[PDB]
Symmetry: C2
Subunit: 152 residues, 2 copies
């Protein structure tokens, strides 16, 4: 513990369930072009797993690897917005996507994740009839509404 904070409601899309969480800023290796733990306010995460009936070769509950994800963070109260990128991470609870980020004060935030399929990071689909899977979904957006008062 390792206390983590819900960012809004999980959404089911493209036979995946996609959630947002945040927690204390984390130290990572290799490091790194973002912000060090110190400079950051939180570590923002995307939790993305296949559900039942996944067309792309993933079983129910399995982590979806090789995604390319960027974020748009909006403080709805002040209208201040920030952009950036996540990386693939592994922690004591498993794989996720994320970034140490600077927040923009107390507020009612909207976070949009811009998601591209595993093809854009070099994971290759079998396509033959015998061993192949469904075509990749198009790049898409998912959003989350949450309140932030900082940690503790």
């Amino acid at each position: 513990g390792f206390k983590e904070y819900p960012a809004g409601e999980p959404v089911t899309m493209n036979e995946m369930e996609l959630a947002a969480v945040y927690l204390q800023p984390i130290d990572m290796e290799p490091r790194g072009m973002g912000l060090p733990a110190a400079k950051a306010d939180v570590h923002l995460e995307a939790d993305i797993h296949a559900v039942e009936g996944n067309k792309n070769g993933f079983g129910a509950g399995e982590w979806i690897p090789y995604l390319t994800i960027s974020y748009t963070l909006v403080n709805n109260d002040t209208g201040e917005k920030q952009e950036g990128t996540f990386m693939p991470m592994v922690a004591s609870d498993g794989p996720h996507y994320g970034a140490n980020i600077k927040m923009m004060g107390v507020g009612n935030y909207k976070v949009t994740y811009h998601i591209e399929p595993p093809s854009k990071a070099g994971m290759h689909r079998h396509t033959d009839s015998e061993t192949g899977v469904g075509r990749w979904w198009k790049p898409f957006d998912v959003s989350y509404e949450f309140k932030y008062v900082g940690l503790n």
Copy 2:
């Protein structure tokens, strides 16, 4: 189906299980590796966590972001081939593999040269609160098998 054939004995190291299998050559996107027409097999590395894994992966879960090359040798002739796998996903799930042209029927040894997820751009949490163990050093694993054409 999708009919696959084991290549050697699976081996346990660095808290993983590492097996080899091959099957008919496959089609990959993008259209343009060796085309199915110019290959004899699709050779794979099957790599999953086992209980007690020190790097954040639950027993049974695929190890993602590996960098894998291979040396394949026909022991009958001593002829060698060197190549690299890519990360793939097929109907039964993800793996690491490549369409390969073999060096005849015979007795084979294939070695996989495995680098940790760090090299492919996965980042491990290092802090006490959320962190896991150091990555293993790059290592080799080899598999002895008979190849007679498929099959």
